[PDB]
Symmetry: C5
Subunit: 269 residues, 5 copies
C-alpha cells in the first residue's frame, strides 16, 4: 500500500463503538459466563492436559465500517484509517462484591468478608486493519490442549521460548488460548497492541476507568491502521484475577472491554 | 445541542459535599460504615442483606436561573477531595489488634479494597448494569435490574440505567456506561483485596479541566449540575473478626460559565 | 483583600522546623513517640488516654518589617511564592537494633522489624491559621481534657457535617484522628497530604534540597500573610515502633520548611 | 577516539533480531527457558552452584550491510519481552495455592525480575561483582577465578566484555559504567521470591539511542551488538523445588550512515 | 563567594565509593555488616561496631587553577553498581521452604536506603537518632550523650561528613538548613521482607545548577562525593541477618567559573 493524502472536512471522519465480552472458558448464556471452570493442576509437564473451559482464550471481532464514497474514475482508493481510540475495562464496579460464595478472610472463624477477586491481571488490547499476527509460545510444550482450542499441535521444546516457525493470526473468537499465543512484534505493521501482566494468586487487582482518556494510533509516519476490506479488527484479553470458593476451588474472572475508534478517509494507490 | 460562543457575571462557582452511603443509616452510631458483611455458600442462595453493601452517592445542584438562542451553564473545571483522611490514623476504636493472640499492639486499622470514583455532568450519570453473580437477589431497598440473566455477568447492551437516586444503586451492580455519558466526565480507580493498605492523597492545589476535545464542558440541562461518587476506603475489622465497609465524604468545587446554544 | 502589583529588597526567605507531637512529653526519653497504644472493646467505651495518639504541629513565624508607604491608600503584605519542605531524620529509620521485636522472635533472631505501618504526611503554608473540618472514625470516642475536640459531636461527625469546624490555633493538642484540612475554606492556605495505611506497610520517604513547590494560585497570587504572620502546620506519622512484648507506639519525624516571600501591594 | 563528521543520505537500514534466554537448561530439550532446580549452599566457604542452576546473559552480533570512512550509527530501537502471555498458565505441574487441601490454581511464576538490554557498536563492557567471592563457578561458566574479597564490592581490576552467549553468569557480571561509551544499557531488578512479576508489551514504544552530542552507537566492523537478560521469576513444583524461568527478547534497530575520521 | 561569568574550560571526573556496611575491607564479608543483635530496652542499647552501616565519602582532587577561577559542578551520572549480584539465590541463604529444606534462597530483602551528595565542601549533617540513650562504639563519630531532643530536630546537634566509614547512617542525615553548595538526593523504603527495586542505565544525566544557574563551587579545588546504598538484609539458614550494600559510580562534569 502506497499511502497518499488525508481527507479533511465533515464527511471524512467516523466513530465506531464496540464491546468484546471475555472468553475465560465457561459457556455463554449459562450461570458461570465471565468465569473459567475450576482450575485443575497436572503433576508433571509430561501428563499435562488442561480440560476445555479451565483456561481463558482471546476475544476478537471484525467491525464492518461505513460506506466510503469511492471516486468511480480515480486510480486511487479510499480506506478508513484508525487515528485514535478510547478503551475501558467495563464492570470494575462488580469487584466491590465480597459476599458471593467467596472464601472468607477468617475462614477458621467462619467470619469476615469474602477475599474477593485476587491474583494475576492480564490486560491487552489490539486495534488493526487486519487480524492480529500471533507468536505461539507456551510455558510447557508437552501440554495437550483440547480439541475445542486452536493451537500448534506437538510444537516441540523450542515453543517454550522464541521459534520463528511458530506463527498464527487471531482469526476466531474464544478459541486461541491466552497462555499459548501472544502478539508477534516481527509483524503487526498495520495493528497497534498494548498489554500489561501482573502476576500472583493473592495480588490485589488495580483498574482505572474514565471517559476522558484518548490514545493516538498514528505510527512514526503519521499513518494509523488501514482497514483492509473496510474491516476494523479489535482483539483483547482482560483477566482480572481469580475467584476462590469456600472449598478453595479457583476460577479465572474476566471483564468485558469497550472500544471507541475514530477513523478518517486516507487516499491510497 | 448545537453549541455557539462562550458569553464573557458570566462565571459562577459551586461547592458541594456528598456523604458516603456504605449501608448503615444516617444520624445513627454506625453512619459511614456498612453493617457487618455475611457471605453466601453458593451463587444460587446469594441474598446480600440491606445495609451490608455500599451504594452510589448523587446530588443535583440548582444553578442560577438563566433565560432563538438559550444560555446554559458550562462546567469548565473542578476540584475534588476525599475529606476526613485524617480519621484513618485512629487505631484504638474497637479494632482487631495486630497481635490478637497476645491481646497487644495497635488496631489493624482500615484495610482492603479502595473504590474511588466521581462524575460531573449536565444530566444524571448513565449506568451499565453488571454483577459478579447474576443470581444474587438484591433487597427491596436497592435499585437493580431484577432476574437480569447470565449476560449481566459481562456486557449486555439491554441492561442500562441512570443514577437518579442517592444511596440505593448498589456499587457492585452498576458502573459508568462508556457508550453514553457524552455530557458527563467520570474518573475511577479500584484497588482490590481485604488486607491491602489504603493510599489516599489530598490537596487544595489540583484543578481538573472538564472541556472535551472540542473545548466544550458539561452543559447543565434544566440549570442542574449532577455530582456522583463512591469512596470505599476499605474494611473495619472488629475483635470478633466481623468486617464492614468504611466510606468517606467527597468535596466538589465546580467552575461554570455561560454558553450560547441553538 | 484587593490584590494589586508585585514589587521586584522585594524578596525574603524564612527557614523553620516543626517537631512532631506524637504524644509522649518533650525532652523526656520517649520524645518523638506516642505512649504504647491501647484499644477499646466497643465504640461506646472508647476513651483513648492522653499521650497514646498524635496531634498536629503548628507555628506562626514573625516576618521582617515591610517599610510601608506612609501616604499610600494601599499596604504591603508578604506573599509566600514557593517553598521547600523535607521530612528530616529519615536516616534514623536504618536503626534495627533499639528494643525492637525481632524478625524471627520464636528463634530470638534476626534484625528488629524497624518502623512499619501507616504513614500520614501533610503540611500547610498560609497567611492565617489552617481551617479544619472535625471528622472522627467513632463519634462516641471520649477524648481527654488535654486535647482540643468538639465534645459529643454526634453521629454526623463520622462523615461530613458543615457545623463541625475549627482552626489550628495551638501546637500539639488537635488530634490528627479528629481534624483534617477544610476544603470549603483555606482560600489563603496551600495544604498537601498523603495517607498510606496498614500496620506492616513499609515506610517510603524521599529527601532532597533540589525540590521547590510554587504556592501561587490560578491567579498568580500566593498566600498573603495577615498581621505579617506566616502559618506552618504539619503531621508526619512515619509508622509504628514494636517492642519485644508487642507493645506498639506511633513514631514521628520533624519537618523542615523554607518559604520564599515577596512584597505584594493590596487595597 | 573516533572523529565523527556528517550524517549521510539508501542511507537508512532496519534490523530485527530475537535473543532466546539462557536460564541454564539445554536448548531443544524439555526444560528450555528454565534453569534446573536451585540448590543452596550451607556457607560461603562451600558454595559451588552447579552448571544449569543459574542464568547467563544472552548476546548476539548482527552482521550489517558492508560499507573518510562510513559506519552504521544506531539512532533508535524498539525492544519487547515476548511470550508474557504464557505466564497466564497456572495448570502446568505447579505448587497449588492451597497445597494442604490439594486445591486452587498453580501459584504461577513469582519472585525476582531482572530485565536488562544493551545495544552497542562493540561488545558490552562488564564489571565483575558477586554476592560471595568464595563461590566456585562451574567449568562451563566464564568468570574471573579466585577474584578476592574486593569482588563483593567495586574493584577496578575486575573487568570483562560480553563476548559469548549463555556462559557469563548474571550473578557475577554487570554493565561497567566506567566504560560503554559506544553502548546504551538499561536495567531493572525487583527482588523477592513471592514478588508478583510486572511486565508490559507494546509495538508503539521507540527509544532514541543518540547521546548528549547527537551520536548513536557506531558499529565497529559493521557489527551491531545486542545483549540482554530477562529473568521473569521462579517456577515452583509440587515438591517445592524452584527454577528460574526466562523469556525471549525482541530487538528492532534503525541505523543510518555516518561519515567518520 | 560572589559569582561572575562562566569560561580548556570543561573537565570530567569519574569515581566509585565502596559501601561501609560494617565488616572490614579485604576480608570475606566485605560489603556486609556483621550479624545484627537487638537490645531489650533503650536504656541498655549499645550497638557493637561492624553491626551498622556508615556513610561513604571521598574528596576528589581537580586540576589546580590560579578575579579567581573555581571548578563548578554542572551535571552528573550516578549508578548503583553490581545490581546483577542480587540474582544469587544459592549462597548460604535461608530457603523459601525451610521446613522442607527446599526452594531457592530468599535472597536480599528488606529496607533500601539510597542517598548521594555532590558538593564543593563536606556534606553538612543534622544529628538525629531513633533512641538517644544508644551508646555508639569508640570507632564511630557521633555526638556523645546527645539528650532526648536528639530523637527529633535540635538545632545545636550539627556535624559535617569529614571521614569515610565512621558516621553511622542511623545517627546522621543531610541538614536542609545548610548545604547551599551541595546537592543531595535520597530515598528510604523500610521493612525487613520488602523486595529491593534497583534500576541502572548509562543514559541518565542530572543537572546540578541551582535556581540562579550556579552549580556547586569546589572550595580548594576539591569535589566532595557522599553516599549510602543499603540494598537490604542477607538472611542465613540460622536466621542471622546482616546489612548488604553496593558500590556507587559517580561521573561529574565541571566548568571554570570566575568568582571575586
Ligand atoms: C516440571 C516437571 O514436570 N517436573 C517433574 C519432574 O521433576 C524433575 C525436573 O524438574 C528435573 C529437571 O531437571 O529436575 C529433577 O530434579 C532433580 C534434578 O534437579 C537433579 C540435577 O539435574 O538434581 C536432583 O536430583 C538428584 C540427582 O541428580 C538425581 O539424579 C536423582 O535422581 C534419582 C532419583 O532420586 C531416583 O528416584 C531414581 O531412582 O534414580 C535417580 C538417579 O539416577 O535424585 C537426586 C535427589 O537429590 C533433582 O531432584 C526433578 N525431579 C524431582 C524429583 O523434582 O519429575 C518429578 C518426579 O521425579 C515430578 O514429576 C515433577 O513434577
Ligand atoms: C464497633 C463496635 O462497637 N462493635 C461492637 C458491637 O458490634 C455489633 C455492631 O458491629 C453491629 C452493627 O450493626 O452489628 C452487630 O452484629 C450483628 C449485626 O450485624 C446483625 C444484623 O444487623 O447481624 C448479626 O446478628 C444476628 C442478628 O441480626 C442479631 O439480631 C443477633 O442478635 C441477637 C444476639 O445473638 C443475642 O446475643 C442477643 O442477646 O439477642 C439478639 C437477638 O435480638 O445475632 C445474630 C448473629 O448471631 C451480627 O452479629 C455487632 N455484634 C457483634 C456481636 O459483633 O457489639 C459487640 C458485642 O455485641 C462488640 O462489643 C463490638 O465490638
Ligand atoms: C460459585 C458457586 O456457586 N459454587 C458452588 C458450586 O460449585 C461448583 C461450581 O463452581 C462448578 C462450576 O463449573 O464446578 C463444580 O466443580 C467441579 C467442576 O469444575 C467439574 C468440571 O466441570 O470438575 C469437578 O468435578 C468433577 C466432575 O466433573 C464431577 O461430575 C464430579 O461430581 O466430581 C468431580 C470431582 O473432581 C469440580 O469439582 C463446583 N463444585 C464444587 C464441589 O466445588 O457447588 C458447590 C457444591 O457442590 C458449592 O456450593 C459451591 O459454593
Ligand atoms: C555467610 C556464611 O558463610 N555464614 C556461615 C557462618 O556464619 C558466621 C558469620 O556470619 C560471621 C560473620 O562475622 O558471624 C557469625 O556470627 C557470630 C558473629 O556475628 C559474632 C561477632 O562477630 O557474634 C556472634 O558470636 C558469639 C561470639 O562473638 C563468637 O566469637 C563465638 O564463637 O560465638 C558467640 C555465640 O554468640 C555470632 O554468632 C556467623 N556464625 C553463625 C553461627 O551464624 O558460619 C556459620 C557456622 O558457624 C554458618 O556456616 C553460616 O552459614
Ligand atoms: C523502648 C523501651 O526501652 N521499652 C522498654 C520499656 O517499656 C515501657 C515503655 O514503652 C513505656 C513508655 O511510656 O511504656 C511502658 O508501658 C506502659 C505504659 O504505656 C503505661 C502508660 O504510660 O501503660 C501500661 O502500663 C500500665 C500502668 O501505667 C503501669 O504503671 C503498670 O505498671 O502497668 C500497667 C499495664 O499493666 C504500659 O505497660 C513500657 N512497659 C512495658 C512493660 O512494655 O520497659 C520495658 C520493661 O518494663 C521493656 O524493657 C521495654 O523494652
Ligand atoms: Mg517487521
Ligand atoms: Mg456514545
Ligand atoms: Mg470556599
Ligand atoms: Mg568513562
Ligand atoms: Mg539556609
Amino acid at each position: 500500500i502506497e499511502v497518499l493524502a488525508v481527507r479533511t472536512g465533515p464527511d471524512s471522519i467516523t466513530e465506531i463503538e464496540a464491546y468484546l465480552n471475555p472468553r475465560m472458558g465457561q459457556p455463554q448464556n449459562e450461570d458461570f459466563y465471565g468465569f473459567s471452570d475450576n482450575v485443575t493442576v497436572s503433576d508433571d509437564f509430561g501428563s499435562d492436559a488442561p480440560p476445555w473451559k479451565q483456561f481463558p482464550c482471546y476475544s476478537t471481532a471484525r467491525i464492518s465500517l461505513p460506506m466510503l464514497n469511492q471516486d468511480m474514475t480515480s486510480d486511487t482508493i479510499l480506506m478508513w484509517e484508525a487515528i485514535s481510540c478510547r478503551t475501558e475495562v467495563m464492570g470494575v464496579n462488580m469487584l466491590t462484591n465480597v459476599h458471593s460464595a467467596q472464601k472468607r478472610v477468617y475462614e477458621n472463624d467462619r467470619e469476615g468478608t469474602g477475599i474477593g477477586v485476587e491474583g494475576m491481571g492480564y490486560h491487552m488490547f489490539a486495534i488493526g486493519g487486519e487480524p492480529l499476527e500471533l507468536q505461539f509460545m507456551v510455558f510447557n510444550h508437552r501440554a495437550t490442549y483440547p480439541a475445542e482450542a486452536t493451537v500448534i499441535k506437538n510444537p516441540g521444546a523450542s515453543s517454550q521460548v522464541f521459534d520463528p516457525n511458530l506463527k498464527g493470526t487471531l482469526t476466531a473468537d474464544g478459541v486461541f488460548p491466552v497462555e499459548a499465543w501472544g502478539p508477534d512484534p516481527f509483524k503487526n505493521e498495520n495493528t497497534r497492541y498494548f498489554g500489561q501482566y501482573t502476576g500472583g494468586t493473592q495480588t490485589p487487582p488495580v483498574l482505572t476507568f474514565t471517559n476522558t482518556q484518548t490514545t493516538i494510533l498514528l505510527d512514526e509516519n503519521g499513518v494509523g491502521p488501514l482497514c483492509k476490506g473496510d474491516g476494523l479488527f479489535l482483539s483483547c484479553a482482560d483477566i482480572v484475577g481469580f475467584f476462590t470458593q469456600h472449598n478453595k476451588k479457583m476460577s479465572f474472572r474476566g471483564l468485558p472491554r469497550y472500544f471507541r475508534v475514530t477513523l478518517r478517509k486516507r487516499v491510497v494507490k
